[PDB]
Amino acid sequence: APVELVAQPVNAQILPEGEPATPMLGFNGGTPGPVLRARQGEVFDIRFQNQIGEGSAVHWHGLRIDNAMDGVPGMTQDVVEAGGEFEYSFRAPDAGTFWYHSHNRSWEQVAKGLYGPLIVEEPTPPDVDHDLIIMIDDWRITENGVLAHQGRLGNFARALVEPVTPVRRGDRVRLRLINVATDRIFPVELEGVEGKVVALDGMPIVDPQEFSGLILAPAQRADIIADVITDAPIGFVFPTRDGPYLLGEIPVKGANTTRQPSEIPALPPNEVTSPDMGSAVSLTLTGLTDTPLHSFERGQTARIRLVNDTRFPHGIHLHGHHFFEVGADGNLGALRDTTLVDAGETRDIVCVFDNPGNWLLHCHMLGHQAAKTWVEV
Q: Is the separation of the CB atoms in 63 and 56 below 8 Å?
A: no
Task: Give CB contacts under 8 A, 24+ apart, made by 102-106.
Answer: 102/7, 102/25, 102/56, 102/57, 102/58, 102/59, 103/56, 103/57, 103/58, 103/59, 103/71, 103/72, 103/73, 104/56, 105/59, 105/182, 106/182, 106/218, 106/315, 106/362, 106/364, 106/370
Half-sphere exposure of 140 (CA within 13 A, CB side): 12
The yes-or-no answer to whether 126-263 and 264-377 have a common fold is yes
Q: Is the separation of the CB atoms in 223 and 177 below 8 Å?
A: yes
Closest listed residue to residue 119, CA positions, set 100, 137, 106: 100
Closest listed residue to residue 181, CA positions, set 266, 90, 96, 109: 109
CA-to-CA dists, residue 45 to 72, 80, 86, 115, angstroms: 18, 17, 11, 17
Q: Count other Cβ atoms within 10 Å, centred on residue 288.
A: 14
Task: Output Rg (C-alpha) for the chain, integer angstroms.
Answer: 20
CA–CA separation, 101 vs 114, rounded Å? 6
Give the fold, CATH level 3, of 126-263. Immunoglobulin-like (2.60.40)
Amino acid identity, residue 22? T
Enumerate the domain spans of the chain.
Answer: 1-125, 126-263, 264-377
Q: What is the CATH class of 1-125? A: mainly beta
CA–CA separation, 289 vs 53, rounded Å? 27
Angle at 320 between CA 338 and CA 282, to 5 degrees: 60
Amino acid identity, residue 17? E
Amino acid identity, residue 79? V
Tally of residues, the chain: 377
SS (H, E, C) the chain: CCEEEEEEEEEECCCCCCCCCEEEEEECCECCCCCEEEECCCEEEEEEEECCCCCECEEEECCCCCHHHCCCECCCECCECCCCEEEEEEECCCCEEEEEEECCCCCCHHHHHCEEEEEEECCCCCCCCEEEEEEEEEECECCCCCECCCCCCCCEEEEEEECCCCEEECCEEEEEEEECCCCCCEECEEECEEEEEEEECCEEEEEEECCCCCEECCCCEEEEEEEECCCCCEEEEECCCCCCEEEEEECEEEECCCCCCCCCCCCCCCCCCCCCCCEEEEEECCCCCCCCCEECCCCEEEEEEEECCCCCCEEEEECCCCEEEECCCCCEEEEECEEEECCCCEEEEEEEECCCCEEEEEEEECCCCCCCEEEEC
Experimental method: X-ray
Q: Is the separation of the CB atoms in 311 and 345 below 8 Å?
A: no
Closest listed residue to residue 178, CA positions, set 210, 142, 134: 134
264-377 maps to which CATH number? 2.60.40.420
- Using CA atoms of 162, 4, 219, 138 in order, give the dihedral in degrees to the nearest 10: -60
